Write a protein that binds this ligand. Structure first.
Ligand SMILES: [Cu+2]
Length: 99
């Protein structure tokens, strides 16, 4: 599935920000607008025994050009909360369920 970082009007949002995938399905996060952006999974808000480090960016890492992507595949089922670190307070957060 594809997920925009930033809406086409420059809003600080994931598009879409809530979605479900099947296990081992890849997510392509693409830098669209209002970057730099990143994608961090909340270590306290993912399925038990998942290593966040394996599925996220560092808080200190950035995508800073139009069309940079980050891709991940999730296999444990459950809900995964993520955010963009610099824009978290703007409300650039999301949630995926692996079902
Ligand atoms: Cu952002």
């Amino acid at each position: 599935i594809d997920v925009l970082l930033g809406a086409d009007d420059g809003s600080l949002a994931f598009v879409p920000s809530e979605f479900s995938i099947s296990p081992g399905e890849k997510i392509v996060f693409k830098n669209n607008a209002g970057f730099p952006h990143n994608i961090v999974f909340d270590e306290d808000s993912i399925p038990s025994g998942v290593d966040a480090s394996k599925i996220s960016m560092s808080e200190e890492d950035l995508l800073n050009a139009k069309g940079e992507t980050f891709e991940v595949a999730l296999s444990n089922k459950g809900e995964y909360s993520f955010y963009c670190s610099p824009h978290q307070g703007a409300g650039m957060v999301g949630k995926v369920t692996v079902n």
